[PDB]
Design an enzyme around this catalytic site. Structure first.
Site, PDB file in Angstrom:
ATOM      1  N   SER A   1       5.172  -5.934  -2.053  1.00 56.62           N
ATOM      2  CA  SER A   1       5.413  -4.513  -2.217  1.00 56.62           C
ATOM      3  C   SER A   1       5.826  -3.935  -0.854  1.00 56.62           C
ATOM      4  O   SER A   1       6.753  -4.453  -0.248  1.00 56.62           O
ATOM      5  CB  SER A   1       4.106  -3.863  -2.782  1.00 56.62           C
ATOM      6  OG  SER A   1       4.270  -2.484  -3.098  1.00 56.62           O
ATOM      7  N   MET A   2       5.161  -2.889  -0.368  1.00 55.20           N
ATOM      8  CA  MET A   2       5.544  -2.347   0.944  1.00 55.20           C
ATOM      9  C   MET A   2       5.466  -3.377   2.069  1.00 55.20           C
ATOM     10  O   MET A   2       6.182  -3.265   3.049  1.00 55.20           O
ATOM     11  CB  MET A   2       4.788  -1.059   1.266  1.00 55.20           C
ATOM     12  CG  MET A   2       5.547  -0.137   2.174  1.00 55.20           C
ATOM     13  SD  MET A   2       7.089   0.510   1.411  1.00 55.20           S
ATOM     14  CE  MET A   2       7.620   1.442   2.830  1.00 55.20           C
TER      15      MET A   2
ATOM     16  N   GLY B   1       0.836  -1.193   0.000  1.00 54.60           N
ATOM     17  CA  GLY B   1       0.000   0.000   0.000  1.00 54.60           C
ATOM     18  C   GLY B   1       0.870   1.242   0.000  1.00 54.60           C
ATOM     19  O   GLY B   1       1.884   1.274  -0.689  1.00 54.60           O
TER      20      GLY B   1
ATOM     21  N   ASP C   1       7.031  -7.122 -11.449  1.00 54.26           N
ATOM     22  CA  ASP C   1       6.631  -7.973 -10.329  1.00 54.26           C
ATOM     23  C   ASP C   1       7.522  -9.210 -10.261  1.00 54.26           C
ATOM     24  O   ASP C   1       7.704  -9.941 -11.236  1.00 54.26           O
ATOM     25  CB  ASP C   1       5.184  -8.453 -10.444  1.00 54.26           C
ATOM     26  CG  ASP C   1       4.159  -7.380 -10.212  1.00 54.26           C
ATOM     27  OD1 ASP C   1       4.479  -6.204  -9.978  1.00 54.26           O
ATOM     28  OD2 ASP C   1       2.969  -7.758 -10.298  1.00 54.26           O
TER      29      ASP C   1
END
Lengths: 182, 187, 179, 186, 186, 186, 185, 179, 186, 179, 182
Positions: free
Chosen positions: D92-93, D63, D166
């Site tokens: 991700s984060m 996010g 990704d």
């Protein structure tokens, strides 16, 4: 706003004194709650009267019959008191209170009319739906005849369209026993 | 709004108060959430007392067949008898559950409505996907009808015929059919 | 139902966890937390995971799966109603000999679902990922059922509905709980 | 979300009950609301006991980068070691926070998924506004990559290459990469 | 859901921090948020007029007038209000960060600070648009004058540096005079 | 989220109300007025002599709702101090001006705005006439009271409220809408 | 849109003006509009390669690439294209106004000219945002270089003067070098 | 719209232009094209511009205004129904002595409307622009009516409705066309 | 609204250009557009199998299969098809630009050319996603092989250069081999 | 709409104008243009305006009204179906002695409708404007019907439906066209 | 209407017996194509017709309106795939006169099973399933006849989306030749 009065919301406080508020459209949720309150009050005391206050535009016929049959099933007398309005299934429930203990306040409105519904699909599906709603109307009219003293023929005529009654007219009709004068 | 009842410093909503007396209220469409709750209540009541009857009040238009079978199988699994009482309406999976109560302890109130009909569903996609979905709903109907035959005493052939379209029954007709044992007449 | 326990909290006191919805991260987080809490309360007593679920997120499901395998108590699984897709995977993941279904419960197995949008090379990455996820699921299901990976691949190409008895025969559960 | 009662009657939701044992669940997309809660939980746990480890369980698609840095900087600021444990997915984060746990105390369960990629954003308006937005996200990426280099032992050049698109890693691959220290085997 | 902490009494995590004189400003600033933050500041002054208050800031900014309700309350009360940027302080958020007690304005190392001119709108008749324009320009002059006082930068420099979005690192915000120290982890 | 204080549990606004502080921090509608009126009546019942403090950060709202508050202020025995924080616009500025004489304040950067009432009318010509006459009479009523409370003539108030008129705190004092600007102790 | 008949040939009013080598650019510039204008310019060149063309402009601008389709077609063809601003020429509209044949760029006295930098957007990964930013910046450089050539102003002055919306009267546009003359009545 | 030519095209043959809608760029483009066409057909004969318009875009209105002043033929203006805002400006722009209204026609004058969003400096630019536009409109109206700019400014602060006779007294038209 | 030209036949302007063997490709490429362009190409071949055709291109691209309908029709017919980029030729538009007759591919000086990999999507079962992925990858290989043949660049270079959006000036497009000449004005 | 000319264009050839919709600026433009065209074709022959309309814009209606009074030919009005609000005003506006309704046609009169939003002073301006418009309508209706302004005001306070015979008695028409 | 040569480019091609099928197949499109085919037969019952196909497919019944019209009329109908022929589009491609079915070299052909839906009662779903399965049998049988492939092979090869190059479509028997450019 629903105020608090140990803490009780206003309605829970009235239930403690055997008063049930039927103050909305009748659907399955409302009927569940009212049925549960009736059964609870019978369990608390099988002899003391219950007071069902009614301000309702009506709603589901089957939900209304859940309430109606529970009233007739339990031992305590259920007084009915119309405040504001009792329309359609609401007026049916008003008429279902203990004989001699059905009331309306002087400016309360009562309305009676035939059941409403719908049907979509094949001709034979529409036929089934029509036969069902007609049988439901016969059932409602027969019970209303029994509870008011009016003939089935008269009830059929008088419910063909929306029929608004004053409290005094409802008493004359047999939907209630007395107008509660202040 | 659902009212609260207090007993002596312990607050109950009315449904929780009825559950204390072994009454379960099935008063809505049957979905997985409703089935979860009813199953949990049944298991809780068995744990509290494995011998005393449970009372399942039914006012339901039906709903999910699999959710209904979660309730059905839990009723048959537990030791206490589960009485069923139709108030208002028991339609489709609701009438199936009404019929599933302990033998001799299935009831309806006099003006309650019972309706039986075939299962509903849908399928989209490739021909072979539609085939799989059709075979599955047909097998589900066979399962429902077989159990209803066992619980009512009616033949599977008759149940198939009688559920082809919506079939509305009065409480007395439901008794005659074998879906309930008695109409609960008021004193 | 509720006493100011709700009924689920009351069942949790008796080491019963109800998985009664689609599996998403919120549901997985709750179930994982319940499993860890129960292990902390008693590391030896069995846990009972009741399953009525259409499945949902594979990663959320793996959070539950790995937590089951990680903790010391045996987790019994009991299918009530339906266990589909990741729900059937979790059913099959219960302690060996302690996986059950009620007689009219439905089990469904099928391949994972997903999506990909964007550039050709993005779509390639997404495709490779979901294919690797399927391989992972099938390998574990093979281990837990005793069926070959080849058979699982074929049998999950399309929606495959099984009765409780069929699920037992397949190796997804150990016993049908007869009343 | 169930409730647990510990009587002497005090009621806890499941997450509050775990927090009592110094376990924080990061089980959703990271936005400011989530970060504010997690930061508050970390500060609370440090105030309760400045020496005992904290356990941060992670199942998150990531996010907001700034919300993630609020969590990251709080972890580094406080005295207790914060263990990180990936369950399900850390993307991700989320993977950045996984890698941010105390050295030697970053874990994943065997079937957990880790994904790393470059930051995402947007810009609309005048050319000069778009330039400002581009320079900002590029600087944010350099910051993220530098830290990930420090925490993994990989070069910045390798991290840049490996996060261009990704990049999905198994738990074992994430260990080999240096994003975690151990796979928690049952 | 924010978790609960029990000490006999239950607290949500924010209420538990407030007990230790920590206020979380963790959202966009609007009148509701300002009401809450102002009330918390007044409550903490009433509890102890001498002890420091800690205002943690993770905010994209928001209403200038709501921000001034907070700003003027900070200056009005007797306790020093420390400000600590965690995550982001943008626009009115950065203005509040700069408004903390002199020497007690902080940011965590990876926190983002952004300064820019006020935003608004006007529709209607030419004379209505004129009134709206004159108002926002006067509001900008007020903001810049105070920022000049709090940072030590000239009004001319602030005007230039806020013409467009201007992103600062924590260290840059210190060099600018928006904060006093970067809180480096031990 | 509004925090709780435990002394009995209180939300922060309830805790301030214990000290005779009422926070008017939103648009004025019937709900807000009903609450503020109830709070004023409650405080009078608790102590009919001690001052009440009404903090105002409001863009205004319903004139009739505002008059419910205004008349309650004038009806009760305690003096009601008014304190503008952030903004007092339209009916908010009217209420600010309605505080006890000598006890109307604004913080230094607070904004005050005065303007004529807004409304609408649809339907037949005679219905539009009735609505117009009503809003014009309402404006006369507002202006007369504002004249009485500020010392300005009705003519001047009419002219000065024809369009949005923004005032600084010092300008509001000069105008007679407040008595003092609350300057902070250095 | 009215019809004009010359006797039996029916024309809508725009087609009637095109017969006299007048092209109306009276809307936002998008690919459809550019395709039409380009086709009109090429048709007029084919009809007569020597006679002037008149391009009337009342446009808020629009797509830069669509605008460059028009711009390059103007420069490519043989006939001089006179430009006449009526109402407004903003953004890419003002760029096209400035692109008319030297000495034959006009505005009516109360016409509005506005110049500003290009607008756009970018979403996605950091490296995608970088590519988009570099592209719009290069596009701005291209626009400014050409505007410098056509106005006689320096690139840096054009950069400064287009940082925000910059409204010019017809006389100011002449002083700037965007047009050659104000058409006085 | 009936055919005879559609009726508007038939009227255009007789040098009548109907401005019967809100003024936007499409409408202006059509009116400008009609004016230029009529000049090309005959540079000496009068043109008649009938106006029933609530106004609209100021720049679109100025495209029409400047085209009227640019061409050689006198353009008579005739207000039928309503001329409001930019519509009243165009009514006032007709050839001196040849601006008319029918007896029950409504004329309304008011200041320009617009909007601005964004940064303070963007709002400042937009405000300065609409203020300059208002100065331009008022200066031209002053020239065409004989009223001072100060009076026009005052009189247009709010919606100002004029009867045909009041519009004549104001100088917006020359004559009321009595039947 | 497209103007009409009368010669006694009436023509819309595009029909008038088509009479002189000019086809305008001025929109996104979809099946409708391709149908029209293919039909125009076949019509022009029938009218005269030897005379050149001019295909003007201002297009952001679009459907690859629609683009191949045009591409294959160009190669199938007897006349040389000159391609001329005006404004922009992006994605499938640049592919068509590069597909013109050798030596007769042009761009105007300020025209933009952009090349990038194909875009698409896939939803559903893993095996469905696999089929979709393999298809788009096969499609990219096909595009790149043809672009290699038409530009003289290696497939490896084309793959690299189309990984992301790659904007080329007219001169750069010539240097790349996408066009033969920049059409400079006389 | 069939072709013969579309049929409306066919009827226009015989000097018949059909007003068969709500009155807005577009409809008024067309009707005005048709009236002016018919006058140009023949300045002496009668025109026939058939009316079936619920009314609409007052200003648009006045564009039609003033054009009728301006031109030389008599304009007969014939109500077919309904003439309500501005439609009944136009019916009443036909040449004296040449206003008709068919026997089952409905006529309705009522006060003008509108709206106003904004500041008190803006609402005041809007109210004054609509009240002045009503005064104008009522004065003309008084002149055309022979009824007093006081009576028209009373009789239009609410929707007032009239039969064709009642409309004749009222003075809105001259004759009911009996078959 | 795209360009004119009122009289449009498609009408101009139709004059030369070329029909363009360039969209999704629905009843409107089928009705037009069927009408064009009948018109061309009436103009000349011996001369070939050329049906160019760039279509993602669409309605199976609409496709069969076209298919049966092709087979009914006397002229040979050549089919030429340009761009793509998918689903019912590839079926129509395969339906052209024997020896006169073509694709351009980069054209795409895709075959797959029919798609549909069903909602309602179990017996209604059964009827819908049986209908789409019978429709698939009908399509596959005809494709078998036109390609020379077995029904078993067609069934397997259409279970999922199956993309073919022009050369693959020739090898499969869906077309006769790939039209290579000179």
């Amino acid at each position: 706003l629903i105020p608090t009065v140990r803490a009780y919301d206003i309605y829970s406080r009235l239930l403690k004194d055997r008063i049930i508020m039927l103050g909305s459209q009748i659907d399955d949720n409302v009927a569940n709650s009212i049925v549960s309150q009736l059964l609870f009050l019978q369990a608390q005391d099988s002899e003391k009267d219950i007071y069902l206050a009614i301000n309702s535009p009506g709603g589901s016929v089957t939900a209304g019959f859940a309430i109606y049959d529970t009233i007739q099933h339990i031992k305590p007398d259920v007084q009915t008191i119309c405040i504001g309005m009792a329309a359609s299934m609401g007026s049916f429930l008003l008429a279902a209170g203990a004989k001699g203990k059905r009331f309306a306040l002087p400016n309360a409105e009562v309305m009676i009319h035939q059941p409403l519904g719908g049907a979509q699909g094949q001709a034979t599906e529409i036929e089934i739906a029509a036969n069902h709603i007609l049988k439901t109307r016969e059932k409602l009219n027969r019970i209303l005849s029994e509870r008011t003293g009016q003939s089935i023929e008269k009830i059929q005529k008088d419910t063909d369209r929306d029929n608004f009654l004053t409290a005094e007219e409802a008493k004359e009709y047999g939907l209630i026993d007395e107008v509660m004068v202040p």
